[model samples]
Target: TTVMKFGGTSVGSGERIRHVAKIVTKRKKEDDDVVVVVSAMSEVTNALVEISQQALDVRDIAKVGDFIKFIREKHYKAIEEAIKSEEIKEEVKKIIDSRIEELEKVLIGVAYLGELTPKSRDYILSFGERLSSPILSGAIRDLGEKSIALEGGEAGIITDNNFGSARVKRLEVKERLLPLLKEGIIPVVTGFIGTTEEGYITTLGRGGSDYSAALIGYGLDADIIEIWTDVSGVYTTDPRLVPTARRIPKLSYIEAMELAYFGAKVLHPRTIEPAMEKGIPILVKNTFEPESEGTLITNDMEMSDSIVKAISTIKNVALINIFGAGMVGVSGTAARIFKALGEEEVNVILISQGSSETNISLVVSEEDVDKALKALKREFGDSFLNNNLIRDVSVDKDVCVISVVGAGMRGAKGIAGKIFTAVSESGANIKMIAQGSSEVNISFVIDEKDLLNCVRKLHEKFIEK
Candidate 1:
């Protein structure tokens, strides 16, 4: 059995949905048990969010009716083009209508209350997957196959009550999925959204459909998990930035995780955790060109000749510095700083503390830098001026982190020296640096203005050689 996940672009239109059905049908013809996971059509989720915002702004339920009608017609038109059989088309239309109506009721409630709570937002966002899965299932049925469309909750995907970023429970998934596989049913399951124990709707955060596929693969303990997206595979870097960037044929789980964390857009960083726990291999393939060999991710592979397999960068991050003479010998200073950020729900992406212990620096998304800085000041303002415990809290919002990653770096020497040499030679100042003890990645902060030139220079120095 295999779990195949298709992204939004893979099923963006009726024609694309038909292509997906053909792909799945081919796999079924080979007598393999399959589970199909789907994301909402391209732009549908965004449209829904815009509609919600518009409704909330106007404080009028009727304002959303046009948006609802637009969505209804969009899916209905897709059904007309994809499902040839009148019966199947009608069936899919009814399903679309029912889901749209449910969405309308929720939006109406939001308007009536003149607010959109996280819980209500999650429910509103869920209509994307709830509507797309059935349309794909109907297309598959029209192709003469037994398919059942199921929501993540109905498919037995239970999650916590985190509202916008729920975590999967995992205990109940296999029990619910096994019967469908045995009965020879292709479960076209919704991705990204799940139900809480109390039946409240919750969503995994954005780019969660990949995480959903990983969860399903873990539950089934399937032989392989495939993520079908628009890209052929992972690359050494963003090809758009460096036209010479090449595709990586295979990657270790650790390397892939590092790349994802540092901003390789191919897979969500969390998507690898479940599969990694079970030693499952993940293949990232392009739906538009299925015959092309794609990237493979597994627990281990023969060592590559190159020590560094890829370089990745994340932009629009802020670097924050905390330094003072008092922090040098203080045991709780680091703990206190982190605790304050945690209380504010700020996610620190990279951290570097000098051995002198007088200074600690970290990076966070630009969006959260203001709140994070405020939290730090609120926690330590007295110490900075009156008690002289801390000397300064400063921020540089225009910074980016560049990370070089590979499993081959475990026993490698001089990698850091080489990286520093490359960046220094390019005249880009390295503001901060961090390397995990595992030695798989070395990340550093540089000015955002120098991002592209730095990446191209590093790629030329490290990869093009």
Candidate 2:
């Protein structure tokens, strides 16, 4: 059995969906069963997020209608292009129309309340994959193949009702798909989405379809989990930033996590864990250029030369520093600060502290700046009262964190110095730095404006030459 997971780019357009149809339909599976998992077309999920976000802040019901109309047109046009069968086209269109209407109604329902809860957002955002699955399945049928569309839930992927970022607890996956495969039908499953034990729609997270694919692959013990995307494979750096960035031919699960942690999106750790644990190999290939040698992720000890292997940058973050001379050896000081932020659900992205512990710096998304600060202020009653426990609290709102990851970074002499030298020459002021005991990663924060130049410089210094 093969689990083929196509990202947003793989099925981004009507033409792309047609290409997917050709690829899925022509697979030479003499006796193999193939299952396809697909995401919402590129930019569709973003627009849904925008719609829900806008509905939450502003009651722009008319703009909501406009967004819905554009989404409707995109899906209908895709149906026209990918499916040549009038029967399949007509039936799929009705189902799509019904779904699109439900989405519009859902948006309006949230707008009236002027509030978007997590559960509601999950339902609102799930429309992305919900809209794309049937069209792809229909296109497959058009090419003289037997296929059926199924929600991740109906396909036996069940999770807790956590609203967003739901984890898979168990799978009825094989039981549901085996009979269909026995009948020689290709089951097209929606990605990045699953259902609650109570049967409510919940999402796995952004770019979560890959997780869906791996889970299905693990449950069925497939031979391979192939992820098709626009980019051929993992790169030394984001090609968009440094056009010369080249692909890394092979990777291990640990190195893949280092890259994905900092911002490499080709494949996330959650998606890789299932395949890794089951000893299944994952192939990250380019749909547009299938002939290319995409990255192969397997468990092995082939370490790169003692140097940085990849650079990843994340922006839209703020650096927060809490300082006080009294904080030195102050037990539960860090604990209290983090515990307060947890109450507000503010996730700290990164943390760095010196040996003295006079000051502690951490990173959080820009959106949580206010809540994070409020949490700290409230947590430290001394801030409100007259006391000197925390002398100062500061924030750098527009900064980005860059991570240089490689297994060889740990014991390699002067590797850390070389990394710093690259950024120092690039003229990007390092705001804060943090390195974990794993020693495989070295992360630092700098001004967001310097991210592009810094990443390119690091890539040139560590990866290219």
Candidate 3:
């Protein structure tokens, strides 16, 4: 038994959905017990978010009505063309109408309140998967397979009331889904949306469908998990960035996680956690080229002779620095700095501090730079001037974090020297650096303008060699 997850692009249009049906049916014929997890149709989630924002204004509910009509027609049209049977088409259309009507009711309520809470936003977003799953299931049945559309909650994906980024309670999942698989029914589960034990609707954040599939695979303890997406596989680097970039046929889970977290864009950063915990191998395959041998992520593999398997970077980051002689002996300085940012919900991307403890530097998204600075000021305002507890707070917005990743770096020598030497040769200055204790990655911040040159230089030195 295996859990197969098809991304939004895999089922974006009527034709794509039909192709997905063929894929599922082919696997079933091989006697594989399959559970199909699907994302919302491509661009559907964004459309819903826009509609919800418009509805929040409450000035004109008619706009919300128009958006609802657009959504209704989009899904109904797909159902009409994809599901061949009149009986299944009618059934799927009714399901679509019911969900759209529920959305309308929620939008009306949001308009009346003139606000959209996180809970309300999650409810609005869930309609995407709710509408797509049934259509996909109906198409699968049209292709002569027995399948049923089940919302994440219906499949027992219980989560907390985190609203916008809910965490799944994995133990509850298998108990709810195992019976259907045992009975030879393909459970087409909704991705990215789940319900709390109290039944409040919640989402697992953006790009969460992959995370959802990983959770299900963990719960089922399946033989393997396949993540079908548009890309052929994980590459040495962004292929568009470097024409010489090549697909990595296999990678360790640690390497994949580092790449995903450092802006690989092929998989969500959290997608590897659940599968890693259960030791289930994840295959990243292209839906368009299903026969292609894509990247395989597993616990251990033949160690690559290369010291650095991939180079990845995140752009538009701001570096925040807090420094003072007073901080050298302070016990709670680091804790206080993080607490302030945490209170403001600022996500820190990287942190580097010297042993002298005279300063602490961290990186965050450019969007949060202002808020993070404000939070730090509020936390240490008087101390900065009166007590001299902190001397300065500063931010640099023209920075990006570049990471060199590989499991082989564990026992390797001179990897850091090689990386810094390459950057120095490229005339790029490293502003700050932080490396994981696992030795899987070495990350540093540099000027955004030099990002491409830095990545290319490192790729040439390590990968091309």
Candidate 4:
């Protein structure tokens, strides 16, 4: 048995749902048992969030009630169109209506109070999969295959109560997922949502669906885990940025995580952590084009020739520097700065320290730059700021963080040398470079405008023959 996860676009409409069903049906015919994971319809969750935000702004709960009905009607209409049998369609419609009514009541209460907590928000957001699962299950059954709908928690995905960013309780899940696979029934589990031990609905943040799939894959120790998305496979760079960017056939789990963390859309950064820990290989393929050879991610590979497997560039980054000659060779100075920033709740994106210990630089979200600067200034006081021992807190906006990842590059002769040469040749300046001691990946910050050129030149040097 294997685990297969299809994302929003893979199961968006009736036609897409039919495509997924066909894929599963063929696998079943080959005598392979499948546990399918699914995400909510494309853009539905975001739409629901917008509705909730609007309701909160206007202090009206009835609007949420109306939005709930609108969403249910939309799902029911899709169900009616996808399934041929009148009885099945009716059953789906009834189930959807009942669920939406429950949501409407909850939203009404939230609106009347003019407040919605994270716990409440999680339950509200769950309406996406809550509505999608029934429609998908009905569509699967319409194709004459036995299918069962299950919420992630119901399928034994016990998680800690982190609300919008819950973490799975691994042992609790391992106990439950195995027995379900033993049964002949195809368990169609919802993605992106789970519940805490205390029975509160909690979400897994932005890429919750993908994370949920990987978590299950780890718990079950499945033969393989496949993530089906709209794109054919993971690309060397954002195709839009670098037209010459090619598709990557394979990547190590660490490489994939670095790429995803920097900016790649291939998978969520956190999605691969659990699976990687278990040494499970993950396949990234397209649901629309199943014939294409997708990217395979694994730590086991004989070849390690590429200096850089992929390029990921993140825009909207702000660079902040805090330093002084007085702080150089001074113990606990850097600690004080970081401690103050931490207390202020400012998230530092990237940090670079000088060998001489004279300077420290870090990048953070642009939105938090002011808060970070103020916090640093208040903590460091006038000694460093006025004496010119500390240089200006150079704030550079419109910069992007570009990362080059590959396992082969570790200890390889002239890897960083080649990268710098390529970037310079491409007319791009390297603002900062940081490589982990393991050498699995190297990251550099650069001007956003130079992103494409930097990626293309690096791709040419590393991935291209």
> Which scores better on lDDT, 1 or 4?
1
Better of 3 and 4 by lDDT: 3
The residue-by-residue lDDT of candidate 2 on 1-465, one tens digit each, is: 888888888888877898987878766354369999999999889998888899888888898899888999999998998888899999999989999999988899888888899999999889899889999999898888899999999888999877788999789988999999999999999999999898999999888999999999998898888888887888888777899999888877877877775334656788888988998888888899888889988887476564677888788799999888778894688888889998989988799889989889989998999998888889875352566477789988889999898888878878878888888899898888888988888999999989998998898887888
Q: Residue 134, candidate 1: how far off, in angstroms?
A: 0.2
Model 1, residue 27: what's the lDDT? 82
Q: Encode model 4's per-residue lDDT on 331-446: one tens digit a residue.
A: 67778878879988787768888798877888887788888888877776535447434555678888888788777787688888888889999888888878878787788888
Model 2 C-alpha lDDT versus the unseen true structure: 0.86
Error of 1 at 277 (Å): 1.1
Give residue 229's error in model 3 in angstroms: 0.4
Candidate 2: segments with Cα more than 4 A from true spot: 28-31, 53-68, 104-108, 111-117, 262-266, 304-306, 382-388
Question: What are the TM-scores, per candidate, against the unseen true structure?
Answer: 0.96, 0.91, 0.96, 0.93
Q: Kindly state the number of residue pairs that clash in model 1.
A: 0
**In what order do the candidates fall by lDDT, top score first?**
2, 1, 3, 4
